[PDB]
Amino acid sequence: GDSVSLTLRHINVRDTAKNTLALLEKVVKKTEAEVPGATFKLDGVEDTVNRDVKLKAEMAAGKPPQIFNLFGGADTQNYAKAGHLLPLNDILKELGLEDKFFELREFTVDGKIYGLPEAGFVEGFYYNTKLFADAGITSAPKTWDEFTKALEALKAKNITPIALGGGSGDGWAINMLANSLFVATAGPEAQEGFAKGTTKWTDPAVLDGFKRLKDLKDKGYIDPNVLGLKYSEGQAKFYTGQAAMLFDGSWATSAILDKDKSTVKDNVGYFRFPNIGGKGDNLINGGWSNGYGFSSHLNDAEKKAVKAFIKNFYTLEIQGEALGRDNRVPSMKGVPTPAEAAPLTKAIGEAQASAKAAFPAFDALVQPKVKVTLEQSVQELLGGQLTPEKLVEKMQKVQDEANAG
């Protein structure tokens, strides 16, 4: 006691996330044993629904859950400004956690920390080394010209080159590829400038990225049924051997290595987005963007339970179990290399380590309305209802509106 009930909003709803959910449940059970009186009510919600609908609406009402999956950057800035996020600096000092994270920048607003990343990420191309060899491609492409040559060769063998599930409410999956394209063509400063008014979506180098995205679809390099598939169905297209590569975040590794379902688990490699030439060269999309935040509206009993949860979730033993089983990338420093380290994770590590630098996802840097508009727009682009030129015009219109607000 005191008796206290806390809702814990998480996104670990899909079958492929069952190990992540079980680890969360283990931490919750430990916390309940440590804090008599405290009961956690887990509320699992699909990724897009939580971020873009449910938590958004709860925050608008000033009634978020006590604990919730949260994104750094724009989302955290909005909710912190509105006064709905618990500042964590003193808690981190109390728990010995102040210096334990690789990077808290996305969750920091005016020096105060408003969430804790659960994992790191990079985005890049997972690829099927067998299908590449079938098409005569014997190395991972380093440059755009080598990449287009590989796509040509795969297409000529009637191998679907790029898996992608971007239908329904899953436009963000298209935006993974779009974001690396427009950073490759325009440089990382372009996406930093959209919300500051110093760059525009209509800048020719940004438009160039959307022209290339459209050309990948026009050529049949992106799966023609992209708009008919959910995100996870695009992943399955890849990890069942039905397409040669997949642009995705490193949180997808476990699905690609799954012994029950992935036929590519022993024939898979990785490469970072290839060099187009210019200020985007040798960069990799990545950072520490997603984890738990906490309501600022907690009584003393609730805050004790929340502190215990933080103590029990953010520990190297939990981070190490996540890495050892699901190849989940630590957000905390000092996790030893697993004794059986996985080749695919080694390849992702090599792509990240040899990059000049990382850049965050564009949705850390633009307002939610801008993000959702891009999702709709890229679906329309791939469906032929919007040209690249009309897309960037529509995007700058919404960006101008958001910047005025």
Ligand X SMILES: CC(=O)N[C@@H]1[C@@H](O)[C@H](O[C@@H]2O[C@H](CO)[C@@H](O[C@@H]3O[C@H](CO)[C@@H](O)[C@H](O)[C@H]3NC(C)=O)[C@H](O)[C@H]2NC(C)=O)[C@@H](CO)O[C@H]1O
Q: Which is nearer to ligand X, 27 or 35 (CB)?
A: 27
Q: Which is nearer to ligand X, 150 or 246 (CB)?
A: 246
Distance of closest approach, residue 341 Cβ to ligand X, in angstroms: 19
Q: Which is nearer to ligand X, 137 or 250 (CB)?
A: 250
The 3-class secondary structure across 62-91, one letter per residue, is: CCCCCEEEEECCHHHHHHHHCCCECCCHHH
- Say if strands 268-271 and 116-128 run parallel, antiparallel, or are unpaired: antiparallel
Distance of closest approach, residue 279 Cβ to ligand X, in angstroms: 21
The radius of gyration of the chain from alpha carbons, rounded to an integer in Å, stands at: 21
Interacting residue ranges for ligand X, rule: CB under 6 A: 11-12, 14, 16-17, 20, 47-48, 51, 118-119, 121, 172, 249, 251-252, 254-255, 289-291, 326, 361, 363
Q: Quickly count helices (H) and strands (E) in the chain.
A: 17, 11
Q: Which is nearer to ligand X, 65 or 291 (CB)?
A: 291
Which stretches of 218-282 are assigned E, i.e. beta strand? 245-249, 268-271
Distance of closest approach, residue 219 Cβ to ligand X, in angstroms: 26
| Host H or E run for residue 324 | helix 316-326
Is 88:98 a contact under the CB 8 Å cutoff? no
Distance of closest approach, residue 188 Cβ to ligand X, in angstroms: 15
Distance of closest approach, residue 331 Cβ to ligand X, in angstroms: 8
Q: Which is nearer to ligand X, 14 or 130 (CB)?
A: 14
Q: Which is nearer to ligand X, 48 or 275 (CB)?
A: 48
Is 124:249 a contact under the CB 8 Å cutoff? no
* Cα(220)–Cα(226) distance, integer angstroms: 11
Distance of closest approach, residue 299 Cβ to ligand X, in angstroms: 28
Distance of closest approach, residue 352 Cβ to ligand X, in angstroms: 14
- CA distances (Å), origin 283, targets 15, 65, 122, 196, 395: 32, 36, 11, 22, 24
* Cα(244)–Cα(238) distance, integer angstroms: 7
Is 301:2 a contact under the CB 8 Å cutoff? yes
Q: Which is nearer to ligand X, 115 or 187 (CB)?
A: 115
